[PDB]
């Protein structure tokens, strides 16, 4: 009592400050690899929303508030089950933790420097596009580290939950000192 609601208010303001920091930064700042922020805040906010909706349904103001709290509890349960199903279906096939991105049905593997780099791609067409700008590579809107234009792979893979699609370097061009563009297209799909 008294001090309890003060600690509750302090905790709510603090966690809303972390939600403030994680929403305005991380994804829409420069798109580096700190996406675990949004992951850890979303994993905190799924059972938090579940607990608040359950506690509002247990002690309701009226019947309409009870049915609204039950509706949002069922909606949060449905979206959590959908996220776990769509992320588990992409983890038994690929050994990458980027399948735990909040919305991801494809993973882009790009090999350079003797290593493949996996990024949680959101949607690909039948012909993806690589853009090298100085010492930096961007492929379908994802920051793929640093990679020179001349050392660009002629084969990349994208791993859907039911198929593996192989893309090969169909077109390429260079305009700067080491900056250029490239167009990859599918040539062979592999059934998982």
């Amino acid at each position, epitope marked *: 009592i008294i001090a309890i609601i003060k600690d509750w208010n302090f905790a709510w303001s603090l966690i809303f400050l972390l939600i403030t920091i994680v929403l305005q930064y991380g994804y829409p700042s420069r798109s580096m690899t700190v996406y675990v922020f949004k992951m850890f805040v979303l994993w905190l906010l799924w059972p938090s929303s579940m607990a608040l909706s359950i506690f509002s349904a247990v002690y309701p103001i009226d019947l309409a508030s009870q049915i609204i709290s039950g509706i949002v509890a069922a909606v949060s349960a449905m979206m959590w089950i959908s996220y776990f199903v769509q992320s588990i279906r992409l983890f038994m096939r690929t*050994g990458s933790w980027w399948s735990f991105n909040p919305e991801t049905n494809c993973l882009l593997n790009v*090999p*350079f*420097g*003797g*290593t*493949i780099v996996v990024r949680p791609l959101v949607e690909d067409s*039948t012909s993806v596009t690589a853009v090298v700008t100085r010492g930096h590579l961007k492929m379908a809107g994802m920051h793929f580290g640093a990679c020179d234009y001349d*050392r660009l*792979p*002629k*084969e990349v*893979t994208v791993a859907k939950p039911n*198929v593996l699609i*192989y893309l*090969k370097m*169909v077109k390429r061009q260079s305009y700067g000192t080491n900056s250029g563009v490239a167009i990859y*297209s*599918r*040539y*062979r*799909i*592999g*059934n998982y």
Partner: antibody
Amino acid sequence: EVQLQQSGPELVKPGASMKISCKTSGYSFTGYTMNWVKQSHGKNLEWIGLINPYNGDTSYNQKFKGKATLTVDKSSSTAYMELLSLTSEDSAVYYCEVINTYWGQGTLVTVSA
Amino acid sequence: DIVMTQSPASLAVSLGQRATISCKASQSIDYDGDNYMNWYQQKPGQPPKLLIYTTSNLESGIPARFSGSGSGTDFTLNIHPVEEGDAATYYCQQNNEDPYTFGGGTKLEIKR
């Protein structure tokens, strides 16, 4: 500058096991996908399987599930397919390929006594 | 699996004449609106050379004599000018299913 070199012609006895090398060069070897193709009697092209140099991810043909294994040695950049139970129908040429473009020179194996 | 029985087996055309290799399929090889069918050219004593990617696109560094497209369950490769250096064998494939079955054989022989 991508070039795959194979081993060479080999006579094998029935029931033996011949290992076919494919020493790739001129590119970053780990990250592409090797792929093996068997050509028999002059005009009969068949598919065997592919293998990722990064993982051990293979996918064989239905007629080559127990007749072929694919291996990757990531020190000298070599694909290391060996064959099992070399019967009289295996006298054939064998090819590596990467992106369906850069093929190999072709290893000829003859099964005879 | 996929069964490919291409109707020609030995074509005898001349320089300037029309060459057409008609290749078939057992069922559809369509995925995401694209029918995956490769075309290869193999000379005697040589590995196969990839001519055609997904039905319509061209190999880089290959000439544009071989550009027959086809669609559905009918895939024809057309050589319209027919140069002298074309005595080879042309092969179908499907880069869609699991077995990746090749085609039959078409020995194209230049008339003189």
